[PDB]
Amino acid sequence: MPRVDGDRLWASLERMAQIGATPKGGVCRLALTDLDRESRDLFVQWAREAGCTVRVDRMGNVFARRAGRRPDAAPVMTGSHADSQPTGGRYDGIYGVLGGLEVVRALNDAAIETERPVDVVIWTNEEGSRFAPAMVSAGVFSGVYTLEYGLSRTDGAGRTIGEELERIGYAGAEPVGGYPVHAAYELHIEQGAILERAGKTIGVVTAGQGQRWYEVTLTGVDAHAGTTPMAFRRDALVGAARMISFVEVLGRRYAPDARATVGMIEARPNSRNTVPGGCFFTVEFRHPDDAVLDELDAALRAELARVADETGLGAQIEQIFTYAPPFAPRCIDTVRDAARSLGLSHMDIVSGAGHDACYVARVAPTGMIFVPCVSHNEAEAITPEWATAGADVLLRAVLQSAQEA
Amino acid sequence: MPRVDGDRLWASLERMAQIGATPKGGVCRLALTDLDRESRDLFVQWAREAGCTVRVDRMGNVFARRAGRRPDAAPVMTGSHADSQPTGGRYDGIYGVLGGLEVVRALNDAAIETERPVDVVIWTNEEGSRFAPAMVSAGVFSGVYTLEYGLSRTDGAGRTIGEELERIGYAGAEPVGGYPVHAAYELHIEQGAILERAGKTIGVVTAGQGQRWYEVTLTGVDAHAGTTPMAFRRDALVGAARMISFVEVLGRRYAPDARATVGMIEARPNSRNTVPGGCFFTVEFRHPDDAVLDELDAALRAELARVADETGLGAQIEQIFTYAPVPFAPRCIDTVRDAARSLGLSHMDIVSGAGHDACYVARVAPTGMIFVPCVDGLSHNEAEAITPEWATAGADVLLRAVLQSAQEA
Ligand SMILES: [Zn+2]
Ligand SMILES: [Zn+2]
């Protein structure tokens, strides 16, 4: 099997990172800005230079197609997003886009004919910063959202995605999704420390995380600290402290894949010489298994009831967000087998963040490939070896799928 | 032994409560306002009608003196403040003042002569709302503050205490403090629910609380919750939670008199989907025993170090306020307790959880305090209330205490 040109890949990442470069060495390329256009334009140029046919759909998704023996066969698709967070890094999303480009180049150098066409994609507005929601364009593609909804999303100035697509010249003619896709692979940095600390180069992504978000309000009695003895108190902050501790306990209880976090708290009146009579805090559970999330939910509620009973606090809880994550076994195995045949260190991993691939999974057999990083930060970084390794895994996986009858 | 006239005392409280009456049934009578002046003038009028000689000092403190057999003898002093919080009750401070007036009237009715003169005092600006700080005038009296400091405290209008004293006619000529006082007693509502819930009418106040205040900053690592396994986390808020729970443990460990509280917390960045990398919170200890406060300090600092170690969090702690406990005079305390006993009144020892003028006066005179309960422990609220029975009982104890000390050679 062929090999990617690591130096060529690295050079393209270096070149692309100039567009929207921040002084801290990060990237600010918000969706459908002029800088987004400049980045898109450069990809298009490079793709066409690689002999690809580049098309654009009505959500401005860019597809660079490399020829296959069967021009009407469902393609193998790979890619990611080019747009960033306001204080994004040089590799969030774009590494997957340029990794896909290097795959095409590598197939060209090896003079390989595939049975199926290969599409390298840029998804519009993945990060969901200028327009909400995130992953909206892959969402339209995958039937999560309608085209009407996708195009009507507005920024702070009241400009819609549809209006901006026309402004920067990416109001494409192609339908958004609706055609069969044989398989899809997204190469992405981990945006975490699991691979790096485990000393593993390749993350075989098995699933996304399910999520449960809660808001909890504890009600006690505002009291002067000096004049109120401990036995008379209804301290809502102490009640919350008990819950915060128990949330951490729950996270460790369902290790390694559970995420359990209290990230926001507000005490009232929040004055140092008064017993807090109220406290609001959030809870979020993440785990790839809905059954485990149900356990976490039941434990949280049962404990909240015990705390209220013991403390005499009033308690209210409300689940405010619920999300169920599944990648295809075939793609997962293909990714693992590719890593193995390349002699690359690897491990199964769960994605702790959303990606376009999470939605593409709904319409085509989909997998993801993670590489380590030293995210959502201007200092996030990968090594040339990591960049090459992820791209070599991508090449192998895409090639295998593309030769499938 | 003489007895107070409960109906008379109650009538005086109802009448005074008219001055600055609020629709919610409270009192809004800020220090050195015209309402405060009216209240002062009425007390002065009643005191003179009861045969007292009234004097005013340079901080506007009002002293009504009931003559003693030996005019040059050190006086027994009693009283409180007449001024209120913006949403004050009908009994915060003024109960002690009118209690003192009732003591004078009761001594008159019984035709009693005392060895020592008795002073009934109104302290200027106790509540410290219009001018900061609180208890500033008893403070000057007691050496806490200079006269220059006391007179120069300004309100939001740029007007000083000195200027306002002159405006309302209470820029007195007498020196502020600096003379021998035989004993001092202040009658005051508890401003807490200890007496009410224990079913005790009289609180024998043994001390005012010492205080130690702290600021604590825990430093962790900002991290996205979904992508960060528990084992990698440096959660500053969980660290704080551990400390908050421990602070409660410390308060309950030194029951019944310890107060241990985390009243303020600030997490950062305080977003629901991220592991908090920073957390600020306050700690305050209160206790009548400085040795216990020392132990609380040591325990807090020891556990903070243990938690920082075990969690991998950076920790910072600063004691930003220190206040020594104010024990009251043993003889005054015993005098109060003995009085309650002789009157067949239910009573218990209690520690004051709030500052009073008497806390400062304790520095320059043998001082004690007498508490009565208040409904629900409510105070500095317009719905603050005592019963006639409680009002009468507090005044009866004050009468006997003042009487005993004023007859001491
Ligand atoms: Zn991304
Ligand atoms: Zn008071």
CSV table of N, CA, C and O in Angstrom, one decimal, chain A residues 57-115:
chain,number,residue,atom,x,y,z
A,57,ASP,N,-22.0,22.6,-2.6
A,57,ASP,CA,-23.4,22.5,-2.5
A,57,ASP,C,-24.1,23.7,-1.9
A,57,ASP,O,-23.4,24.7,-1.7
A,58,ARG,N,-25.4,23.7,-1.7
A,58,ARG,CA,-26.1,24.9,-1.4
A,58,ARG,C,-25.8,25.4,0.1
A,58,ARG,O,-26.2,26.5,0.4
A,59,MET,N,-25.2,24.6,0.9
A,59,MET,CA,-24.7,25.0,2.2
A,59,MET,C,-23.2,25.5,2.2
A,59,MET,O,-22.6,25.7,3.2
A,60,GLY,N,-22.7,25.5,1.0
A,60,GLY,CA,-21.3,25.9,0.8
A,60,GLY,C,-20.3,24.8,1.2
A,60,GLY,O,-19.1,25.1,1.3
A,61,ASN,N,-20.7,23.6,1.4
A,61,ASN,CA,-19.8,22.5,1.6
A,61,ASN,C,-19.0,22.3,0.3
A,61,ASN,O,-19.5,22.3,-0.8
A,62,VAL,N,-17.7,22.2,0.5
A,62,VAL,CA,-16.8,22.0,-0.7
A,62,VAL,C,-16.4,20.5,-0.8
A,62,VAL,O,-15.9,20.0,0.2
A,63,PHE,N,-16.5,20.0,-2.0
A,63,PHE,CA,-16.2,18.6,-2.2
A,63,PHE,C,-15.1,18.5,-3.3
A,63,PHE,O,-15.5,18.9,-4.5
A,64,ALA,N,-13.9,18.0,-3.0
A,64,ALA,CA,-12.9,17.7,-4.1
A,64,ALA,C,-13.0,16.2,-4.4
A,64,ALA,O,-12.6,15.4,-3.6
A,65,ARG,N,-13.4,15.9,-5.6
A,65,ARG,CA,-13.6,14.5,-6.0
A,65,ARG,C,-12.4,14.0,-6.7
A,65,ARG,O,-12.0,14.6,-7.7
A,66,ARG,N,-11.8,12.9,-6.2
A,66,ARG,CA,-10.8,12.2,-7.0
A,66,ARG,C,-11.5,11.0,-7.7
A,66,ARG,O,-12.3,10.3,-7.2
A,67,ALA,N,-11.2,10.8,-9.0
A,67,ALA,CA,-11.8,9.9,-9.9
A,67,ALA,C,-11.8,8.4,-9.3
A,67,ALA,O,-10.9,8.0,-8.7
A,68,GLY,N,-12.9,7.7,-9.7
A,68,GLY,CA,-13.0,6.3,-9.4
A,68,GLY,C,-13.3,5.5,-10.7
A,68,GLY,O,-13.8,6.2,-11.6
A,69,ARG,N,-13.1,4.2,-10.7
A,69,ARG,CA,-13.4,3.4,-11.9
A,69,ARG,C,-14.9,3.5,-12.3
A,69,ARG,O,-15.3,3.6,-13.4
A,70,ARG,N,-15.7,3.5,-11.2
A,70,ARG,CA,-17.2,3.6,-11.4
A,70,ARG,C,-17.6,5.0,-11.0
A,70,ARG,O,-17.8,5.3,-9.8
A,71,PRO,N,-17.9,5.9,-12.0
A,71,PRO,CA,-18.2,7.3,-11.7
A,71,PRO,C,-19.5,7.5,-11.0
A,71,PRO,O,-19.7,8.5,-10.3
A,72,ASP,N,-20.4,6.5,-11.1
A,72,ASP,CA,-21.7,6.6,-10.4
A,72,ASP,C,-21.8,5.9,-9.1
A,72,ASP,O,-22.9,5.9,-8.4
A,73,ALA,N,-20.7,5.2,-8.7
A,73,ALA,CA,-20.7,4.5,-7.4
A,73,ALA,C,-20.7,5.4,-6.3
A,73,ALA,O,-20.1,6.5,-6.3
A,74,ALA,N,-21.3,5.0,-5.2
A,74,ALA,CA,-21.3,5.8,-3.9
A,74,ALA,C,-19.8,6.0,-3.5
A,74,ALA,O,-19.1,5.1,-3.5
A,75,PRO,N,-19.4,7.3,-3.2
A,75,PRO,CA,-18.0,7.6,-2.9
A,75,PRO,C,-17.6,7.2,-1.5
A,75,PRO,O,-18.4,7.0,-0.6
A,76,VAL,N,-16.3,7.2,-1.3
A,76,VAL,CA,-15.7,7.3,0.0
A,76,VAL,C,-15.4,8.7,0.4
A,76,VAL,O,-14.7,9.4,-0.4
A,77,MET,N,-15.9,9.2,1.5
A,77,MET,CA,-15.7,10.6,1.8
A,77,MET,C,-14.8,10.8,3.0
A,77,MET,O,-14.9,10.1,4.0
A,78,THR,N,-13.9,11.8,2.9
A,78,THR,CA,-13.1,12.2,4.1
A,78,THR,C,-13.0,13.7,4.1
A,78,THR,O,-13.0,14.4,3.1
A,79,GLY,N,-12.8,14.2,5.3
A,79,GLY,CA,-12.6,15.6,5.5
A,79,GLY,C,-13.1,16.1,6.8
A,79,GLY,O,-13.4,15.3,7.7
A,80,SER,N,-13.2,17.4,6.9
A,80,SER,CA,-13.5,18.1,8.2
A,80,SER,C,-13.9,19.5,8.0
A,80,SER,O,-14.5,19.8,7.0
A,81,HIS,N,-13.5,20.4,8.9
A,81,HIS,CA,-13.9,21.8,8.7
A,81,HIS,C,-12.7,22.7,8.6
A,81,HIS,O,-11.6,22.4,9.2
A,82,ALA,N,-12.8,23.8,8.0
A,82,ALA,CA,-11.7,24.8,7.9
A,82,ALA,C,-11.9,26.0,8.8
A,82,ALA,O,-10.9,26.6,9.2
A,83,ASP,N,-13.1,26.2,9.2
A,83,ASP,CA,-13.4,27.3,10.1
A,83,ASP,C,-13.0,27.0,11.5
A,83,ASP,O,-12.8,25.8,11.9
A,84,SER,N,-12.8,28.0,12.4
A,84,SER,CA,-12.3,27.9,13.7
A,84,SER,C,-13.1,28.6,14.8
A,84,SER,O,-14.0,29.3,14.5
A,85,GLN,N,-12.7,28.3,16.0
A,85,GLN,CA,-13.2,29.2,17.1
A,85,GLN,C,-12.4,30.5,17.0
A,85,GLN,O,-11.4,30.6,16.4
A,86,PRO,N,-13.0,31.5,17.7
A,86,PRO,CA,-12.3,32.8,17.7
A,86,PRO,C,-10.9,32.8,18.1
A,86,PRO,O,-10.0,33.5,17.6
A,87,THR,N,-10.6,31.9,19.1
A,87,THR,CA,-9.2,31.7,19.5
A,87,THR,C,-8.8,30.3,19.3
A,87,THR,O,-8.3,29.6,20.2
A,88,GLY,N,-9.0,29.8,18.1
A,88,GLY,CA,-8.7,28.4,17.7
A,88,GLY,C,-7.2,28.2,17.4
A,88,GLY,O,-6.4,29.1,17.4
A,89,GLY,N,-6.9,26.9,17.2
A,89,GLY,CA,-5.5,26.5,16.9
A,89,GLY,C,-5.3,26.2,15.5
A,89,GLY,O,-6.2,26.4,14.7
A,90,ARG,N,-4.1,25.8,15.1
A,90,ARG,CA,-3.7,25.6,13.7
A,90,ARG,C,-4.1,24.2,13.2
A,90,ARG,O,-3.9,23.9,12.0
A,91,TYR,N,-4.8,23.4,14.0
A,91,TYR,CA,-5.1,22.0,13.6
A,91,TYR,C,-6.5,21.6,13.8
A,91,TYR,O,-6.9,20.6,13.1
A,92,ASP,N,-7.3,22.2,14.6
A,92,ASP,CA,-8.8,21.9,14.8
A,92,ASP,C,-9.4,22.0,13.4
A,92,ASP,O,-9.4,23.0,12.8
A,93,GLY,N,-9.9,20.8,13.0
A,93,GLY,CA,-10.6,20.8,11.7
A,93,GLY,C,-9.7,20.7,10.5
A,93,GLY,O,-9.8,19.8,9.7
A,94,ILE,N,-8.9,21.7,10.3
A,94,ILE,CA,-8.1,21.8,9.1
A,94,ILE,C,-7.2,20.7,8.8
A,94,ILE,O,-6.9,20.3,7.7
A,95,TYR,N,-6.7,20.0,9.9
A,95,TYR,CA,-5.8,18.9,9.8
A,95,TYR,C,-6.5,17.7,9.0
A,95,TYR,O,-5.9,17.0,8.2
A,96,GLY,N,-7.8,17.6,9.3
A,96,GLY,CA,-8.6,16.6,8.6
A,96,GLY,C,-8.8,16.9,7.1
A,96,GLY,O,-8.9,16.0,6.3
A,97,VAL,N,-8.9,18.2,6.8
A,97,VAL,CA,-9.2,18.6,5.5
A,97,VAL,C,-7.9,18.4,4.6
A,97,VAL,O,-7.9,17.9,3.5
A,98,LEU,N,-6.8,18.8,5.2
A,98,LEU,CA,-5.5,18.7,4.5
A,98,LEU,C,-4.9,17.3,4.5
A,98,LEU,O,-4.2,16.9,3.6
A,99,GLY,N,-5.3,16.5,5.5
A,99,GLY,CA,-5.0,15.1,5.5
A,99,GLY,C,-5.7,14.4,4.4
A,99,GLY,O,-5.1,13.5,3.7
A,100,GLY,N,-7.0,14.8,4.1
A,100,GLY,CA,-7.7,14.2,3.0
A,100,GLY,C,-7.1,14.6,1.7
A,100,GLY,O,-7.0,13.8,0.8
A,101,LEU,N,-6.6,15.8,1.6
A,101,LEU,CA,-6.0,16.3,0.4
A,101,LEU,C,-4.7,15.5,0.1
A,101,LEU,O,-4.4,15.1,-1.0
A,102,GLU,N,-3.9,15.2,1.2
A,102,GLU,CA,-2.7,14.5,1.0
A,102,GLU,C,-3.0,13.0,0.7
A,102,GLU,O,-2.2,12.4,0.0
A,103,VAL,N,-4.1,12.5,1.1
A,103,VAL,CA,-4.5,11.2,0.7
A,103,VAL,C,-4.7,11.1,-0.8
A,103,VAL,O,-4.1,10.2,-1.5
A,104,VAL,N,-5.4,12.1,-1.4
A,104,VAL,CA,-5.5,12.2,-2.8
A,104,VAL,C,-4.2,12.3,-3.5
A,104,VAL,O,-3.9,11.5,-4.5
A,105,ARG,N,-3.3,13.2,-3.1
A,105,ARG,CA,-2.0,13.3,-3.6
A,105,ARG,C,-1.2,12.0,-3.6
A,105,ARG,O,-0.5,11.7,-4.5
A,106,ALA,N,-1.3,11.3,-2.5
A,106,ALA,CA,-0.6,10.0,-2.3
A,106,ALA,C,-1.2,9.0,-3.3
A,106,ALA,O,-0.4,8.2,-3.8
A,107,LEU,N,-2.5,8.9,-3.5
A,107,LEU,CA,-3.1,8.0,-4.4
A,107,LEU,C,-2.6,8.4,-5.9
A,107,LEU,O,-2.4,7.5,-6.7
A,108,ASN,N,-2.5,9.7,-6.1
A,108,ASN,CA,-2.0,10.1,-7.4
A,108,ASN,C,-0.5,9.7,-7.7
A,108,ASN,O,-0.2,9.2,-8.7
A,109,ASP,N,0.3,9.9,-6.7
A,109,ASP,CA,1.7,9.6,-6.8
A,109,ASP,C,1.9,8.1,-7.1
A,109,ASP,O,2.8,7.7,-7.8
A,110,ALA,N,1.1,7.3,-6.4
A,110,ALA,CA,1.2,5.8,-6.6
A,110,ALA,C,0.4,5.3,-7.8
A,110,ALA,O,0.4,4.1,-8.1
A,111,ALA,N,-0.2,6.2,-8.6
A,111,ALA,CA,-1.0,5.9,-9.8
A,111,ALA,C,-2.1,4.9,-9.5
A,111,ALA,O,-2.3,4.0,-10.3
A,112,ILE,N,-2.7,5.0,-8.4
A,112,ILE,CA,-3.7,4.0,-8.0
A,112,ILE,C,-5.1,4.3,-8.5
A,112,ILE,O,-5.6,5.5,-8.5
A,113,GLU,N,-5.7,3.3,-9.1
A,113,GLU,CA,-7.2,3.4,-9.5
A,113,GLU,C,-8.0,2.8,-8.4
A,113,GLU,O,-7.8,1.6,-8.0
A,114,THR,N,-9.0,3.5,-7.9
A,114,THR,CA,-10.0,3.0,-6.9
A,114,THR,C,-11.3,2.7,-7.6
A,114,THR,O,-11.6,3.3,-8.7
A,115,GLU,N,-12.0,1.7,-7.1
A,115,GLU,CA,-13.3,1.4,-7.6
A,115,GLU,C,-14.3,2.6,-7.5
A,115,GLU,O,-15.1,2.8,-8.4
